[PDB]
Amino acid sequence: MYKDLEGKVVVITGSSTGLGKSMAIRFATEKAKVVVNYRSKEDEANSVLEEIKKVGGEAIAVKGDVTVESDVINLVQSAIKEFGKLDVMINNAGLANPVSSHEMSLSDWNKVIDTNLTGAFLGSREAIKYFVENDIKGTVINMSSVHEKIPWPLFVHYAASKGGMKLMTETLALEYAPKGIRVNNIGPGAINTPINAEKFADPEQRADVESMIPMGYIGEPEEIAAVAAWLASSEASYVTGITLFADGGMTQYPSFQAGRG
Amino acid sequence: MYKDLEGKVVVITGSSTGLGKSMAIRFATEKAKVVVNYRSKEDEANSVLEEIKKVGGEAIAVKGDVTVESDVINLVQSAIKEFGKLDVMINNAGLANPVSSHEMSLSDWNKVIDTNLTGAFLGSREAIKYFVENDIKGTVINMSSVHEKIPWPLFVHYAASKGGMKLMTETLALEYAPKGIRVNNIGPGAINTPINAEKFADPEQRADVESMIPMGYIGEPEEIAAVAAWLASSEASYVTGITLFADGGMTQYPSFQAGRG
Amino acid sequence: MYKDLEGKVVVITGSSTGLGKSMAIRFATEKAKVVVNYRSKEDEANSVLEEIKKVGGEAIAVKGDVTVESDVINLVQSAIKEFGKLDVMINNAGLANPVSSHEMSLSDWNKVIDTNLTGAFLGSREAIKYFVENDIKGTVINMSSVHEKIPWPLFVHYAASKGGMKLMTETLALEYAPKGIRVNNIGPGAINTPINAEKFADPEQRADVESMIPMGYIGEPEEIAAVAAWLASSEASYVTGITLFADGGMTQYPSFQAGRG
Amino acid sequence: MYKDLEGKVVVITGSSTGLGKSMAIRFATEKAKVVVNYRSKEDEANSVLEEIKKVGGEAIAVKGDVTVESDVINLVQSAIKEFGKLDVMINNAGLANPVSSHEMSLSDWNKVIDTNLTGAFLGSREAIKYFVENDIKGTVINMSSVHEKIPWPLFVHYAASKGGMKLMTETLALEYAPKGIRVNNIGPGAINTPINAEKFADPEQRADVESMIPMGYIGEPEEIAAVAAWLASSEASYVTGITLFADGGMTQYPSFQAGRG
C-alpha cells in the first residue's frame, strides 16, 4: 500500500507474538525488510518467520532482552550488518501484572519500569545515535497505551512507565526534529492478542471490557498494525511528537455516555 | 491508494482554495465523488473543478455560506441528490483577523465564532442526522489547528473557536460511537496556502515562523490532505475522537530546544 | 483568611444563586467589597445582600444580562463608580439544557454559546480593558467545568462553550501576563446547588452521580468558593492560565476503578 | 493562615535546601510538626532546623537516601515514632544533568529515574500504606515540574521521570479516593533556588530564562510553598489527582506572544 516502505529496514522489539507479530507481518507485506526479536529461545520466532515467508517477505530473528544494554545495541547492529541499514525502529516489548499500589514491591515496580520505559529509551537511543552519525532521516515508533493518559489502579507501574514514555517521545521528537528524525507513539486501547485470550474468553469479563469501549468491540491486532505502517510512511511526513490513540473511543470517558451524571 | 474510498461521496466546506482545495483534489485522486463548496466567487470553484477533471475525478460545486443554516442543510442535500448518498463530511471553512483582546469588538468575535465553530457544528449536525436516519457508518472530519492547544494572543476568538471545536468533536465521537460513526479533528501547523503567501513572502517573517517549527520548514497542503485521506479510510477504523496534529513539532514547545532555560 | 483581600472590589456575574451566591458570601467574609449581579428583577439578589450584611460585608446589586454588551459594560462601570475601582472579575453566569446533538436547533446552540462563552469573553474584555488603561494588576476568574475536558453527550453546546473558555483563558493569560494580570479557570465537578436539588433529590439519580465521583460525595458550594478566594489572593501570585479542577476526582476516569478492563 | 494544619505531621524529602527548605519553614509557620530530610550533609539540615526554631516550630531531621528502600521506610516510621502520626507526605527530592539524548549513558538515565520517579513512588507507597492500615485521610503531594508537560531536550530522563510522576499521581488519586486520601502534584516553573544561583547570576542566561516566562520574572521559593500549604489544608478538600502549575505562564507557549507566527 505504501510504495516508500519497499526496501526499508524495520526493527521491532518483542515481535514473536501479539501486536509485534502483526506489525512484522504487515511490514513484510509492504515489502520492507524486517528484523524480528525474541527473548528466550528461537521458537515462537519461527512462527512469525514462516508467516513472513508466506507473503514473500524477507526477515531474520535476533535474540535480545530489552533490559540488557548490550542486547539492544547488538539488535540494532544486527540489522545494519544483515541488511546494510536501518530505517524504522519500533519499541514494542512490554509487560504488566496487577498489584494494589500500597502493596507493590520495589521488585515488581522496577521490572515494569525497566522493560516498558527504559527498554524503549535504550532502543530509541541506539536507533537515533545511528541516524545522526550517518545522516539518515529515520523514524522511531514507541508502543504506548491509552494508559499514558487514563490512570490505572492496580497497575501504577505500567501507567507510570507509559506516562514517562509520552514525555520521552515528545522530548526526542523536539530534540531531533531539525535532523528530519520523527518520533511518535501509538496508543492502543483493548486489543485482541493472545495475552488477553483468557480474560476475553470469559463472557462476563469480555462484556465488562466492551462496556468501556464506545465503539462496542475489542480491536484486532491488524487495526493497530495499520496505524504503525502509516506513521512509518512518507504520507505522515509532517507528523512528529504525537500519540495516535486507536482505542475505539476509550479515552473519551465511556462512563459519561447518555449525558449521565 | 485507499481502495475503500472509491465511490465514497465527500463533502468539503470552503474548498475552492487552500487546504480545502488540496483535499478535494486528493479525494478525487482516490476516486471518490467530491462536492466542492464556495461562498461567493464561483470562478474560483471552477478552477478546482478543472483540477479534478484533470485527474479523471467526478465532482460538482455548490454555493453556500456556513453561517447560514439553510445553506448548510442545502449543501448536504445537494450531495445526496447528485450522488445518491453521503459518506464523509469535512468542515474546513474558516477565518481570522488579529486584534488585541481588550480592544476586540463583539462583532469581530462573533464573526469568527460563527464561522469556525458554529459552522462546523451545523455541518456535523446535518451529516450525522443523515447517517443516523439511514443507518450509515459515515465519518466527520473537522479542520482544527495547533491552536486548539496552543494559546494565541491577538487571536483570542480563533483560539476559543478551536478549543470549542475540540470538545465538540470529542462529544460527538462519544455520543455516536455506538452507531459506527467516527468524528476526528486534524490540527495543521503552519501550512503553505495562498492566504499565507504574503506573510511568508517576506524573508524576515518567513524565517520567524520557521523558527517556531522544530522540523524547520513550513508544511505543504498535500501533507495535510494525506492525513485527511487516511482518517477517512477503513485503515483508521478503530480511530475516533482524536485530534491528529500535523505540525512539524510545533505543539512540542519550540522555545525549549537545546535544553534552554 | 486572606488579609490582602480586604478592600478589594469583586464583581461576580450570575451571583444571586448557586455558586455565584456562595462566592459572593465568601468574599464578603474576607472583607472584600462585592458587586452582585441578577438578570430579571431585584429579588433573589436581596437574599444574597442580606446574607452579606449578616457577616458585616459591604455590597450592591446590579441588573445585567451577560448576553447584552451594554449591560456588561455598565456592570463593570457600576463597580468603579460605587467603590472607586475594580480588582477581581468573576464570570460565573451560565446555563444548559439536554438535547440529542443531531436534533439540537441552532437556537438552543446559540443561547448556550452566547451565555457561557461570549458572556465570559465580554466580561473578561471589559475588566482587562480597565486594568490596562489604569495600570492595575487585576485578576479574572472564569467559571468552567470538568466538561472543558470531559465530553458530554446531550450537552454538546455546553461542552463546546467550556472547551472554548479554556483556550480563551489561556490566551488572555499569555497575552496579559507581562502586565501582571492573572487569568485562571475553576473547573467544578458535581456540586450541590439549587439548580440540582431535584435531580439529586431522587435517590436513584443521586446514587448514579455519586458513582461517577471517586471521592464518593457531591461537593458543597463552599468547597468551590474556597478555591475562588485562594486564586484571587496574593498567595497564588505566580499562578496564571490554569484550570483548577475541584471535582472529587471526576476527571480521573471513574469507570477505571479496581483496575477494571 | 490555615488553622487545620496546626498539629499535623508533615514529612518532606530533600528538605535541607531549596524548595524543600522553604516548604519546611512555611509548614512550621502554620504550626505543623515537620520532619526534615537530608541525604548526606547534616550541617545543612541543622540550618533549616534553626530557621524553624526561629519561628517557634517543632521539628527533627532524619537522614535518608530516597533511592534506598529501607531509608524511605525508616523515614516514615521516624515520623510516627517521634510525633505519633503522619498527615502529609511530600516527595520533593530530585536531580538532573544535561546530556544529548543519543549520548546519554544508561547510568545517567537510571540515576534520574530512580531519584525523581521511583523515589516518589516509594515515598507515596509507604505513606499510603500507613494511611490505609490506620484509617487516616492523609494526603500526598508530589513535586513535579512544568516538564511533565513541556518536553525538555538534553534532559530526556528528567522529562520522562515527571511524565511518569503525573500518571503515578493520577493513578494513586483514583485508587485511593474512596478512602479520603488525596494525591496531587505541584508543577513549579523557573524558581530562584540555590541550585540555580549561578545560571541566573549570569545576566545573559537570566534574561534568557525570563524571556520564556510570560509574567516576566523568576519565581521565589515562597510562592511555591504557598501552593503546598493550601493543597495540604482542608480548603482543598475536594481537590485530588491534579497538577497545579505555578509557572508564571510558562506552559502557555511563551514563543506565541504578540500573535507571532
Ligand SMILES: NC(=O)c1ccc[n+]([C@@H]2O[C@H](COP(=O)([O-])OP(=O)(O)OC[C@H]3O[C@@H](n4cnc5c(N)ncnc54)[C@H](O)[C@@H]3O)[C@@H](O)[C@H]2O)c1
Ligand atoms: N494488547 C493490548 O491490548 C495492548 C493495549 C495497550 C498497550 N499495549 C502495548 O503493546 C505492546 C504489545 O502488547 P501485546 O498485547 O502484544 O503483549 P504481548 O505480551 O503479547 O507482547 C509483548 C512481547 O514483549 C516481549 N517481551 C517482554 N519483556 C521482554 C524483554 N525484557 N525483552 C524482550 N522481549 C520482551 C514478550 O515476550 C512478548 O512477545 C506492549 O508494549 C503493551 O504494553 C498492548
Ligand SMILES: NC(=O)c1ccc[n+]([C@@H]2O[C@H](COP(=O)([O-])OP(=O)(O)OC[C@H]3O[C@@H](n4cnc5c(N)ncnc54)[C@H](O)[C@@H]3O)[C@@H](O)[C@H]2O)c1
Ligand atoms: N493555513 C494554515 O496554516 C492553517 C493552520 C491551522 C489551521 N488551519 C485551518 O484550516 C482551514 C483551511 O485554512 P486555509 O489556509 O486553506 O485558509 P483559506 O482562507 O485559504 O481557506 C478557508 C476557506 O474558507 C472559506 N470560507 C470562509 N468563510 C466562509 C463561509 N462563511 N462560508 C463558506 N466558506 C467560507 C474561504 O472562502 C476560503 O476558501 C481553516 O479552517 C483554518 O482555520 C489552517
Ligand SMILES: NC(=O)c1ccc[n+]([C@@H]2O[C@H](COP(=O)([O-])OP(=O)(O)OC[C@H]3O[C@@H](n4cnc5c(N)ncnc54)[C@H](O)[C@@H]3O)[C@@H](O)[C@H]2O)c1
Ligand atoms: N453546579 C454545578 O454542579 C456546576 C458544575 C460545573 C460547572 N458549573 C458552572 O458554574 C456556574 C454556576 O452554576 P450554578 O450551579 O450556580 O448554576 P445556577 O443556574 O444556579 O447559576 C447560574 C446563574 O446564572 C444566571 N444567568 C444565566 N443566564 C444569565 C444571563 N444571560 N445574564 C445574567 N445572568 C444569567 C442565572 O440566573 C443563575 O443565577 C455556571 O457557569 C456553571 O456552568 C456548575
Ligand SMILES: NC(=O)c1ccc[n+]([C@@H]2O[C@H](COP(=O)([O-])OP(=O)(O)OC[C@H]3O[C@@H](n4cnc5c(N)ncnc54)[C@H](O)[C@@H]3O)[C@@H](O)[C@H]2O)c1
Ligand atoms: N528549582 C526549580 O526551578 C524547579 C522547577 C521544577 C521542578 N523542580 C523540582 O522541585 C524539587 C526541588 O528542586 P530544588 O530547586 O529545590 O533543587 P535542589 O537540588 O536545591 O533540591 C533537591 C534536594 O534533593 C536532595 N536529594 C537529591 N537526591 C536525593 C536522594 N537520593 N535522597 C535524598 N535527598 C536527595 C538534594 O540534596 C537537594 O537538597 C525537585 O524535585 C525538582 O525536580 C524545581
